[PDB]
Amino acid sequence: PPTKPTKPGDNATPEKLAKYQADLAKYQKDLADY
């Protein structure tokens, strides 16, 4: 099972949240593959 993003997705800068969104995007992809 894909590793769930440990990065802050609640309280973080918009830029850093975007990075979280990119990771979460990867997670969704790998999750779908799972």
3-state secondary structure the chain: CCCCCCCCCCCCCHHHHHHHHHHHHHHHHHHHHC
- Tell which residue, 8, 9, 2, has the closest CA to residue 29: 2
Amino acid (one-letter) located at 32: A
Q: CB under 8 Å to 24, separation ≥6 — which residues?
A: 5, 9
- Do 19 and 4 meet the contact criterion of CB atoms below 8 Å apart? no
Structural gaps in the chain: residues followed by a C–N separation over 2.5 Å: none
Q: How far is CA 19 from CA 2, 14, 28, 34, in A?
A: 17, 9, 14, 22
CA atoms of 22 and 34, how far apart (whole Å): 18
User: Which technique?
Assistant: NMR
CA gyration radius, the chain: 10
